[PDB]
Amino acid sequence: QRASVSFNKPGHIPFGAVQGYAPGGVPAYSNKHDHYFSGERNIEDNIFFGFKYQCVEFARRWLLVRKGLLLPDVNWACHIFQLKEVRDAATTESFAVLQVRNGTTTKPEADALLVYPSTDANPVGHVGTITEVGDDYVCVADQNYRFHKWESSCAYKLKLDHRDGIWTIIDDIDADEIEIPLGWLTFPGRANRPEGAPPVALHPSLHFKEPPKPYLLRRNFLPTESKANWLDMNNPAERLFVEEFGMVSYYESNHEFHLRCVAYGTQLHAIFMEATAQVIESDEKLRLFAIPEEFWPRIRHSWKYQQTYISGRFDFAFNNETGEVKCFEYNADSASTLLECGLIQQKWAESVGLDKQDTRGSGFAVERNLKMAWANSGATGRVHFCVDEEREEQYTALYCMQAAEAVGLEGKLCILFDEFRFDDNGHVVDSDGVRVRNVWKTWMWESAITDYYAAREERGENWKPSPKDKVRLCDLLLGDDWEILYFEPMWKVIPSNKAILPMIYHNHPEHPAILKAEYELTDELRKHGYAKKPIVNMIYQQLFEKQDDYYAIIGGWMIGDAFSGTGIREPFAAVRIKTDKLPHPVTLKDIDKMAEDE
Ligand SMILES: [Cl-]
């Protein structure tokens, strides 16, 4: 009936899989899906090509293999069009490129970098490689645009229009979204390196140097400008926040700290998902995780049916001396503190004047990634956002709801269960008679399980749902309709259970962020030092080694499948990321931009 959903889209190939080869033997690797950021550098033979696998990464790696020229650092792809100078990889000698505008009498040529402008859904623009030119087409090799396995030596072919001697490359593959590139960069006077030529030997001056150690430093600040009414009371979420909490100190990181969180967060999310699958398929593990046996079929169906999810938050610890990040838990079934990270902390920074050019807020990607999670969640139609009478649950719901609605979903906030009736056929419908199909909720699956059993005593087990009956939590979350999409799905209780911590350590002891953890105390744990943590028996976890006497826990947000930001609790504290200044930016608008924006 209703079809299974997943964040993996048909015919898109996994992250890092080879899509194909541009002429001259340059592989394009999959970046999973658009706007995906891995946090992982691609460094081969001491050359830093870019982030696995963004479009500038391919451009730089292509340019080096094909022509032996090194593309300088540039943050936004569209800014490549203002490039005047690359460097010869072997000599470091400067080499001048030629800017050729699209839509003039100059025909494009093979072995040029094609640059797309910034659009509304592609703020960074795009770069690819023109591999071949015909009388009415150009072939383009790139990364991070199309995710299919290539059938030939390019990702796609673009129309090349010719009218009155004027040549215009038009991207009209997708029907509505017609994009017209800015132009392309040629490398006049530089031949392609020979077939079979030995690899390019980068001059030692141009090798990747060790970036500075991550840092996370507590700062104390006396504001220059301080705004009194810095939240928008016409936004419901912000109004409820001000009603809970009302209208200095903060944390500053560097970009290396942020990247480590993105990389470790993304990698851990996969590790936790892998261990969740092992629990799902084991009866003994389901028992250990205190899933009642009666719900085993329900939770196993959830795991197969719904591989989408909106939010989850790691708890990280960080050591400033060693740069080490460790993970204590994945609060994978929660959205608590999202609004604070995604919005409040930036608006606070602006009010006291911290929104200077030299930093950005650490929850900058949250809003965009939320919209993206909702768009690829599988939820269509009406989504009921279901909360208790707690302001925090309400404003978390409203913030997730704003994102849903921004991508064409229709939201209804439901506080407790008065919005809902059973119709003449035993189904939960709302006050518009619309039958429930999608539920985002703050209600915990454990509370639903408890409500399920209470209702079972109260109502009987011969009980048929009828229109006279009040809808309860267990009818909303654990009803006869197992094809309702739930945000956060039922299986999400598994990665959230600390019983998983020994499993991820057994599976992945090599991972730098993984704490040693066992179900029984081992002499290794006694020697290192341990904490004994209960689970709904015990787990024993290794101990992990204060600024102005403040202990701080870092929250690392997964929003859909994207690591989307950090927030701190000492009590909620703002996190600012100091921006990497480029010494030799290609254009002034590229300063303070971030490759994370792609
Ligand atoms: Cl459907």
Instruction: Spell out where the chain is interrupted, by the residue before each break (C to N > 2.5 A).
Output: 247, 536, 545, 570
What distance in angstroms lies between residue 2's CA and the mean position of ligand 1's atoms?
Answer: 4
3-class secondary structure, 532: strand
Helix axes 391-406, 236-245, angle to 10 degrees: 160
Helix (H, G, I), strand (E, B) or coil at 455: helix
Measure CA 352 to chain center. 29
Same domain for 404 and 270: yes
Q: Find out whether 237 and 395 touch, Cβ atoms under 8 Å.
A: yes
Which residue intervals of 214-317 are DSSP H helices?
A: 236-245, 255-280, 283-288, 296-305
Distance 3 CA to ligand 1 centre (A): 6
Handedness of CA 545, 547, 553, 556 (dihedral sign): negative
Positive/negative CA dihedral, 480, 482, 485, 487: positive
Q: Are residues 369 and 245 in the same domain?
A: yes
Experimental structure resolution, Å? 2.3
| Dihedral class, residue 451 (left if φ above 0, else alpha if ψ from -120 to 50, else beta) | alpha
C-alpha 133: how far from its chain's center?
A: 36
The two tokens of residue 503 are 């499993």
Q: Virtual CA dihedral for 208, 212, 214, 217, nearest 10 degrees?
A: -160
* Tokens encoding 361: 């807020």
Please indicate, yes or no, whether residues 482 and 371 belong to a single structural domain of this protein: yes
CATH number for the domain including 513?
A: 3.30.1490.330
Same domain, 223 and 351: yes
What number of other Cβ atoms are within 10 A of residue 192's Cβ? 15
CA–CA distances in Å: residue 82 to residues 72, 141, 185, 271, 585: 12, 21, 9, 41, 10
Domain that holds residue 511: 494-546
Ligand 1 centroid – CA 378 distance (Å)? 8
Expressed in angstroms and rounded, the spacing between residue 292 Cα and the centre of ligand 1 is 29
Given strand 538-542, what is the order of strands in its sheet? 517-518, 538-542, 530-534
The span from the CA of 384 to the CA of 418, in Å, is 13
Expressed in angstroms and rounded, the spacing between residue 431 Cα and the centre of ligand 1 is 21
Same domain as 484, residue 360: yes
Distance 5 CA to ligand 1 centre (A): 9
In this structure, are 52 and 195 located in the same domain?
A: yes
Alpha helices in 320-411 (DSSP H): 338-339, 345-351, 366-376, 391-406
Q: How far apart are CA 431 and CA 419, in angstroms?
A: 6
Q: Are residues 320 and 192 in the same domain?
A: no
Distance (Å, whole) CA 567 – CA 569:
7
Q: How far is the CA of 435 from the centre of ligand 1 (A)?
A: 12
Q: What are the residues whose beta carbons fall under 8 Å from the beta carbon of 117, sequence distance 6 or more?
A: 78, 125, 179, 180, 181, 182
Ligand 1 centroid from CA 11, angstroms: 21
249 with 316, same domain? yes
Same domain, 247 and 324: yes
Q: Of 206, 211, 209, give the one whose Cα is nearest residue 64.
A: 206
Q: How remote is the CA of residue 478 from the centroid of ligand 1, in Å?
A: 19
Instruction: Looking at the structure, tell me whether residues 220 and 162 fall in a common domain.
Output: no
380 CA → ligand 1 middle, Å? 7
Number of domains in the chain: 3
Q: How far is the CA of 376 from the centre of ligand 1 (A)?
A: 13
Contact 413, 341 (CB under 8 A): no
Experimental approach taken: X-ray
Quote the tokens at residue 478.
């654990």
Phi, psi of 242 (to 5 degrees): -65, -30
Same domain assignment for residues 117 and 176: yes
Nearest to 84 by CA among 95, 74, 75: 95
Domain check: are 463 and 562 in the same one? yes
Instruction: Tell me 212's DSSP state.
Output: P
Ligand 1 centroid – CA 439 distance (Å): 13
The b-or-e profile of 364-399 (16+ CB within 10 A means b, else e) is: bbbbbbbbbbbbbbbbeebbbbbbeeebbbbbbbbb
CATH number, domain containing residue 200: 3.90.1720.10
Q: How far apart are CA 168 and CA 101, in angstroms?
A: 9
| Centre of ligand 1 from the C-alpha of residue 4, in Å | 9
| Residue 339 Cα to ligand 1 middle (Å) | 29
